[PDB]
Ligand binder design. Structure first.
Ligand code: CA
Ligand code: CA
Ligand code: CA
Ligand code: CA
Ligand code: CA
Ligand code: CA
Ligand code: CA
Ligand code: CA
Ligand code: CA
Ligand code: CA
Ligand code: CA
Ligand code: CA
Ligand code: CA
Length: 92
RNA sequence: GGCCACCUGACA
RNA sequence: GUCCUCUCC
RNA sequence: GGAGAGAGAAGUCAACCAGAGAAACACACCAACCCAUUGCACUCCGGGUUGGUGGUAUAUUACCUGGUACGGGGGAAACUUCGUGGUGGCCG
């Protein structure tokens, strides 16, 4: 897929509560660059997933390459660039 | 007088 | 206290 | 969204009005398990089981206290006590 500011992440342990997953995710990714926001929803269609929006595309790349299959809550993280831009980035 | 169904009516 | 419709704001 | 109206589900109730007045059911939210989901979103939001919490339900049907229209006693009388849906069927 085409590199993007946001990285789509799935195959995350579904049992983890929303705020906690969101905090861990931030910690693990901060090192790659500033993070404008992190979307996480536990709804039927969105659970097990999360988009992490980076201020700089380059950051999304390193993070993607660096954390592919990383052990997170006992499940290897699957990461890809987001198909389209997230509002925040588009409306900018 | 109970008990089940239904009927009508009250409540909503 | 749900749900449907109608009117009005 | 909010304010009325109508009809109405579930559920409680039974002449009737008034005062007190729960429960039941419906709906909402929370938690814990279980089932399902590998899902690319940016308007929240899958199902199920237990338990819990909530509402101008601050409601009203039981119950209670007053009387009311009929019926039962007693009393000359004043009055004082008792009983109050329709149909079929089943349990003495
Ligand atoms: Ca920060
Ligand atoms: Ca309304
Ligand atoms: Ca009914
Ligand atoms: Ca019933
Ligand atoms: Ca009252
Ligand atoms: Ca009450
Ligand atoms: Ca499974
Ligand atoms: Ca599939
Ligand atoms: Ca959109
Ligand atoms: Ca949603
Ligand atoms: Ca939520
Ligand atoms: Ca319940
Ligand atoms: Ca209740």
């Amino acid at each position: 897929t085409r590199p993007n500011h946001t990285i789509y992440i799935n195959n995350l342990n579904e049992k983890i509560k929303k705020d906690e997953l969101k905090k861990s995710l931030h910690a693990i990714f901060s090192r790659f660059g500033q993070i404008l926001d992190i979307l996480v929803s536990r709804s039927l269609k969105m659970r097990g997933q999360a988009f992490v929006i980076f201020k700089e595309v380059s950051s999304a790349t390193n993070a993607l390459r660096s954390m592919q299959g990383f052990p997170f809550y006992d499940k290897p993280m699957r990461i890809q660039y987001a198909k389209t831009d997230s509002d925040i980035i588009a409306k900018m």
